[PDB]
């Protein structure tokens, strides 16, 4: 629908990071899992934020169990974990289900 893009493979992962680099837009990733309770609780917000920032920020969702290769490379240990990517590299992160911190993180990078 143009909101959250579900990553299903490493190939998709690489294509999306490249997209952020080509469009010069920051990417915010939600590393989650079906067994993660707090992840289930913050997902509604991540989606809303994706509607609120459509066109300014690209939102990706990675199910760690479904795409182990990306999860491992990303260095994930606790859920949920949020990463910000710019020009193809990790630029910032947030770990935990803090709604107030998630909002601040997105707003911060939506700017400059």
Curated annotation (Swiss-Prot):
<keyword id="KW-1015">Disulfide bond</keyword>
<keyword id="KW-0249">Electron transport</keyword>
<keyword id="KW-0813">Transport</keyword>
<keyword id="KW-0963">Cytoplasm</keyword>
<protein>
    <recommendedName>
        <fullName>Thioredoxin H-type</fullName>
    </recommendedName>
</protein>
<comment type="function">
    <text>Participates in various redox reactions through the reversible oxidation of the active center dithiol to a disulfide. The H form is known to activate a number of cytosolic enzymes.</text>
</comment>
<dbReference type="Pfam" id="PF00085">
    <property type="entry name" value="Thioredoxin"/>
</dbReference>
<feature type="domain" description="Thioredoxin">
    <location>
        <begin position="1"/>
        <end position="111"/>
    </location>
</feature>
<feature type="active site" description="Nucleophile">
    <location>
        <position position="36"/>
    </location>
</feature>
<dbReference type="InterPro" id="IPR036249">
    <property type="entry name" value="Thioredoxin-like_sf"/>
</dbReference>
<feature type="site" description="Contributes to redox potential value">
    <location>
        <position position="38"/>
    </location>
</feature>
<dbReference type="InterPro" id="IPR013766">
    <property type="entry name" value="Thioredoxin_domain"/>
</dbReference>
<feature type="active site" description="Nucleophile">
    <location>
        <position position="39"/>
    </location>
</feature>
<feature type="site" description="Contributes to redox potential value">
    <location>
        <position position="37"/>
    </location>
</feature>
<dbReference type="GO" id="GO:0005737">
    <property type="term" value="C:cytoplasm"/>
</dbReference>
<feature type="site" description="Deprotonates C-terminal active site Cys">
    <location>
        <position position="30"/>
    </location>
</feature>
<comment type="similarity">
    <text>Belongs to the thioredoxin family. Plant H-type subfamily.</text>
</comment>
<keyword id="KW-0676">Redox-active center</keyword>
<feature type="disulfide bond" description="Redox-active">
    <location>
        <begin position="36"/>
        <end position="39"/>
    </location>
</feature>
<dbReference type="InterPro" id="IPR017937">
    <property type="entry name" value="Thioredoxin_CS"/>
</dbReference>
């Amino acid at each position: 629908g143009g909101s959250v893009i579900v990553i299903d493979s490493k190939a998709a992962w690489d294509a999306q990071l490249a997209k952020g680099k080509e469009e010069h837009k920051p990417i915010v990733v939600d590393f989650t899992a079906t067994w993660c309770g707090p992840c289930k609780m913050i997902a509604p917000l991540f989606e809303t934020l994706s509607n609120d920032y459509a066109g300014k920020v690209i939102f990706l969702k990675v199910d760690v169990d479904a795409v182990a290769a990306v999860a491992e490379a990303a260095g994930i240990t606790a859920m949920p974990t949020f990463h910000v990517y710019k020009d193809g590299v990790k630029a910032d992160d947030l770990v935990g289900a803090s709604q107030d911190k998630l909002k601040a993180l997105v707003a911060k990078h939506a700017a400059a």
